[PDB]
Amino acid sequence: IKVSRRRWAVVLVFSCYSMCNSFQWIQYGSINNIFMHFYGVSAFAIDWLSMCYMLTYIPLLLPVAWLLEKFGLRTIALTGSALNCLGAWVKLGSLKPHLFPVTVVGQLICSVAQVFILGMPSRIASVWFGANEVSTACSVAVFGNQLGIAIGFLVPPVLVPNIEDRDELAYHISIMFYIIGGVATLLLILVIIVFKEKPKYPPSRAQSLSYALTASYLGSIARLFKNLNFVLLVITYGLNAGAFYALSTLLNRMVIWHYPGEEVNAGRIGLTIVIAGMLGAVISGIWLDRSKTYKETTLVVYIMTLVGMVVYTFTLNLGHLWVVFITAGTMGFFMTGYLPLGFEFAVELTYPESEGISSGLLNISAQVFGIIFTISQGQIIDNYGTKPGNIFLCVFLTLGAALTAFIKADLRRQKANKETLE
Template sequence: MDDLTGRDSTAKDSTASTAKDGTRTREVIAEAGGAEGSGGAQRDGFGGRRAGDGEVAESGEVVDSRETAHPRRRWLAGRKHRRSYSHTHFRVYKRRWFGLAQLVLLNIVVSWDWLTFAPVSTSSAEYFGVSETAINWLSTAFMFAFVTITPVTIWTLNRSPKESIIVSSVLLLLGNWIRYAGTKAQGGVYGVVMFGQILTGLAQPFVLAAPTRYSDLWFTETGRVSATALASLANPFGGALAQLINPFLGSVPNIVLYVAIISTVASIPSIFIPAAPPTPPCASASVSKEPLLPSVRHIIRSPPFYVIALTFAVYVGFFNAFSSLINQILYPYGYSEDEAGICGAVLIIVGLVTAAIMSPIFDRTHAYLGGIKVLCVLVAVSYLGFIWAPQTRGIPAPYVLAAILGASSFSLLPIALEYLVEITFPASPAVSSTIIWAGGQLLGGIFIVIMTALKDGRDVDLTRVREDGRGNGGGDRPPGNMYRALVFEGAVALAVLPFPLALGVKRFGLAHGEGRLKVDEHREGAGSGSGEGDGEEVL
């Protein structure tokens, strides 16, 4: 291994002479075998211990072991030395794509589990002999389960993304097969299905909150948004598959069986993914993150965090509620379950395509703040427009608005998550990401309850709706319509809009200081002392 110290023109004379004599070689690349180590190294995700007596930290400077013996001191030592990047050897590893692919796969199946019954809510209610409100509670309970396990998720994800992924896989396996048992027993036992649904809901936060933590651990500043987008947007993609495919899978037991098989196949590879890279991918990744409790204190003292958290929670909550209720929104106006399912698929597929185009652009420009403001306007206007879309009884209005809503919502999601990590740096991404996702799931469940309560109380004549279709009138407020629920959705989405528009304004105290991107810029400005191999991609 090259001696990385003799080439630094700013090194102290004593250090330079020591390196020249060959008595000490500074190695900043930790051994891969130490990636599963304990203490601070485990929190940072890189192999080996932090520097001890005579050891050298990732920054390239000698650090006394007394400075790093305690987690808090270890983090402070990282802050003290975080500007010294001249000796650090950064690499990205091809194996990161294996872990990312598994994270994508699990986010797809966990969302598919969530919306198993929503696209066929009418058929599901008939099969279990319950009301559509009870079927809505399957989606609602799934989201509330996220909130209840949030503290455990933060702790697990802060330890290791791999541990979080494995926990999710186990819960998915249990939940899916319990749901299937509930659909087959005695012609369908709703309570057993609900229990299985709650278990799958408990699985969701362990993978849904993981993308920012995983991308921070494995990716550079020019790839984090795309990695976060790929893993995060896989979740609504799973919802799109549910909306599009489930109505064609036949009976309710068959739907649950097929989803259980898919979930089982998707969960098995989790035990084989790598836990952490042997070396950091970039300068900001080599900086020690705050321990768990200091991270929480740091985050709750950040005014911009509350703005992002509120905006994110409301818009994610409405997206979840809208996805769960789209069949009930359109069905009273004569739209078939297939047409409602296609509308949900348009919402998500157009969003995925748009996000795939926009995420690399934001990776290069880092124009997070401007993107958030523009996209929030489009999201709010889309919800407002959907108040009147079902009344047209035509395909274009709901499908076009669903496309705009999907494009803006999906493009907003990854940049909001990455901007949040930026403004709360060096707090652990596991903390901020899990908190705001929990807020989105909590509000999603609450919004479903509220919007269901605002539904027109008259029973839908299913036979007449199926026979008449969309083209036979029925008025602007047919039995079972959700007009008032859509008004509530549009009004709240519009009321929240001024908050993200105020981000970055110093007068309101919503400007943020130096963040993660600045650390990477400092490193680029200083250059890498070794130069050789810096930033290369290896296996």
């Protein structure tokens, strides 16, 4: 058993094109106010580009899990990157006001690329890393996806100003499409040369035993719903992660609703939410490494998310840009930091079930509730304004906060750990 230098190269290249793919998810959402003008469509149409990532994940996750089990790690890496690259190049042919379905086709291809991407941050961690480095590698791969949202918020409004000239607008969006298409192609070329089917030597004793050994997905998902505590977590995780998806997808229509212009700052706020959550996730992760208070920390963070969501809901109105930056970062510290926290707490209640099944069902719950939230809050924003849409998120987070309080600390991994110790 030996570890290899290439393990980091695989992580960064995956994290780079996972960042690239998550760039394309919010690519339209981060500059939603302008893509409305370019294609001449209503708001609900553009969020579907971010929502088609969410709608496609639900039915195709199980077939993609089947593909990974047969064709291995590398083919999913190539297929995810190639579809991300192909979807990026397709968007070049959509640079006209009358070619909106073309970018939908391209975004669907990128959305079909996501199921090959979000499923294997933890999968790469087990294949390439030793036991102590799995949690470090898994975080970096996941934070790469989050960094894509942050970079996908900051960059697109810098490249594309708000201009009503259709032809100059087509010119700037082309540059973003060219860079993202160029970056995806470069990453695809990198994926071809650095990704390998298997390491040279097994990286850990756990991985070596897996290779030496070598239940089903249908059986695992069936037994998981027996655990009431896990069922409660899935509903609450979807209530929180789905709220973040709706908040980030609709962030343009609310920040620019009260602040005309300020597309570049609205991207920074989106970056601030994601970046603060990245800092908040690390703090919570290290805190759990010493305290192991998985239930108490999760409930406090969920409550702090509710207070963070409530405070941002009522501070968005006064019109002070800096206070919106502070509370969005304060909310993101807990709301975005909960996203990796929920996966860690899910393994607590589901050990020894594999992380893939637990993360996948939480991912489905995030997609399902995100779509419900995005559609509903989108209709609430149009019909009743931005604050009721945010309060609508607060109500479900209040329900999520109350529901998490009834979750019992059935930390079966902790029981298993102390059983091995004694």
